[PDB]
Design a protein around this ligand. Structure first.
Ligand SMILES: C[S@@+](CC[C@H](N)C(=O)[O-])C[C@H]1O[C@@H](n2cnc3c(N)ncnc32)[C@H](O)[C@@H]1O
Ligand SMILES: [Cl-]
Ligand SMILES: [Zn+2]
Ligand SMILES: [Zn+2]
Lengths: 115, 299
């Protein structure tokens, strides 16, 4: 019944003034991309930065199991688009936010489906 | 300032390859200087980007279901920046395997942890990238002889597991080099030593062999050729530049759809060796990609 919860631990560590996880691999790109959250190639727009997916996954970086059956990772092998305003903590951003299943944009950072 | 500052890097000119220099110490003029990177970009992301930008100018064979293996892909940060650039550069669906002595997280399709000599593959590969480097190799107090170690593995891996028509890019420095690797460059249709503009203050270069032929097209003395490389670096200061990092519109490797054929040794003829030399043919099996790492069991 016991299970380590690193997602809540990282959120509490950030709230107590902890320095965000560093060395996320930022990519060089044109910044004229679609702006979708998780893509097969860097797709950042003018308001985003593109990062290597595995370097932005809390469970990858902490060497712990992913919280789902099959242990599948959404980010490994792909590229995650992070708004430039939040590029200082890519691990925290991908943890706290969700991708829209319709358009593929970050909910609250590009998705305009319910407008 | 100079015209090559707008290029991704500088390749060793042909006239320097034809000399018979003796090995000297490498004394770079712009040594100690550093290039100004774009904000937040790691040195290894910039270095790999300029390497791939230069490989875009060559005649690389790019088949469907391409197979690429990347040695020395881990860093002291626990991540793999070079693998991330390779996966961005290579076509979608390319099978990418990377490896390193130390554990790391990467975007590769599969990762092997351990000494490269423990890595075995059943299949052949279309492209081999190596960033392997031992920092203990830089010892200016002792003579600079040809190094073994992972270079011995790389030479054997190329001759056994590189498909005909495939290419390689192997990182070397002044002290991290191997004579047989230079000699193996003569088994490709074309070869060079490429220095990234972003790391031009270092004796580092990438030995690039383009379109593997499986036979010596030219006899290269490895000891003399490394001396020729150092002589070029000693007399040709390269201005540090990150200009090429700001234009990525033409970065992705072009989908060429190079034909893959499975041929016996006797079937190779001059017409097919011509197709290999032009980057229009890959010769290897198209079976499944299977890899493994040997594990030593002890108490
Ligand atoms: C200069 S680092 C490469 C860093 C990485 N390519 C990047 O993008 O940041 C060289 C790497 O080669 C690895 N290496 C050195 N000797 C090795 C060996 N004999 N077998 C496997 N890996 C080795 C080291 O672990 C080291 O991480
Ligand atoms: Cl020679
Ligand atoms: Zn993960
Ligand atoms: Zn949406």
């Amino acid at each position: 019944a016991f299970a380590v919860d690193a997602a809540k631990a990282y959120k509490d560590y950030l709230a107590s003034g902890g320095q965000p996880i560093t060395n996320c691999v930022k990519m060089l790109c044109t910044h004229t991309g679609t702006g979708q959250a998780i893509t097969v190639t860097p797709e950042a727009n003018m308001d985003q930065e593109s990062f290597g997916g595995a370097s932005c996954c809390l469970y990858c970086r902490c060497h712990i199991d992913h919280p789902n059956p099959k242990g599948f990772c959404d980010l490994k092998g792909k590229y995650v688009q992070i708004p430039t305003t939040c590029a200082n903590d890519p691990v925290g951003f991908t943890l706290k936010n969700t991708v829209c299943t319709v358009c593929g944009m970050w909910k609250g950072y590009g998705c305009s489906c319910d407008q | 300032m100079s015209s090559q500052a707008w290029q991704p890097g500088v390749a060793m000119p042909n006239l320097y390859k034809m000399q018979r220099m003796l090995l000297e110490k490498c004394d770079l003029q712009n040594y100690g200087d550093s290039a100004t990177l774009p904000k937040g970009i790691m040195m290894n992301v910039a270095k790999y980007t300029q390497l791939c930008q230069y490989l875009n100018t060559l005649t690389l064979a790019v088949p469907y279901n391409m197979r690429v293996i990347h040695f020395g892909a881990g860093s002291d940060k626990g991540v793999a920046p070079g693998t991330a650039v390779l996966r961005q550069w290579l076509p979608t669906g390319t099978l990418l395997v990377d490896s390193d002595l130390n554990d790391f997280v990467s975007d590769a399709d599969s990762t092997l942890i351990g000494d490269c000599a423990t890595v075995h593959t059943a299949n052949k590969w279309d492209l081999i990238i190596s960033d392997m480097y031992d920092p203990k190799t830089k010892n200016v107090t002792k003579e600079n002889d040809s190094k073994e170690g992972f270079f011995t593995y790389i030479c054997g891996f190329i001759q056994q597991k590189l498909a005909l028509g495939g290419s390689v890019a192997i990182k070397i420095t002044e002290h991290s080099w191997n004579a047989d690797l230079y000699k193996l460059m003569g088994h490709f249709a074309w070869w060079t030593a490429f220095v990234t503009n972003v790391n031009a203050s270092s004796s580092e270069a990438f030995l690039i062999g383009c379109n593997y032929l499986g036979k010596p097209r030219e006899q290269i003395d490895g000891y003399v050729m490394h001396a020729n490389y150092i002589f070029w670096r000693n007399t040709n200061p390269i201005q540090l530049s990150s200009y090429s990092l700001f234009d990525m519109s033409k970065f992705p490797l072009k989908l060429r759809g190079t034909a893959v054929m499975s041929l016996k040794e006797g079937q190779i003829n001059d017409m097919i060796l011509s197709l290999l030399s032009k980057g229009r043919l890959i010769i290897r099996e198209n079976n499944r990609v299977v890899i493994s790492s040997d594990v030593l069991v002890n108490n």
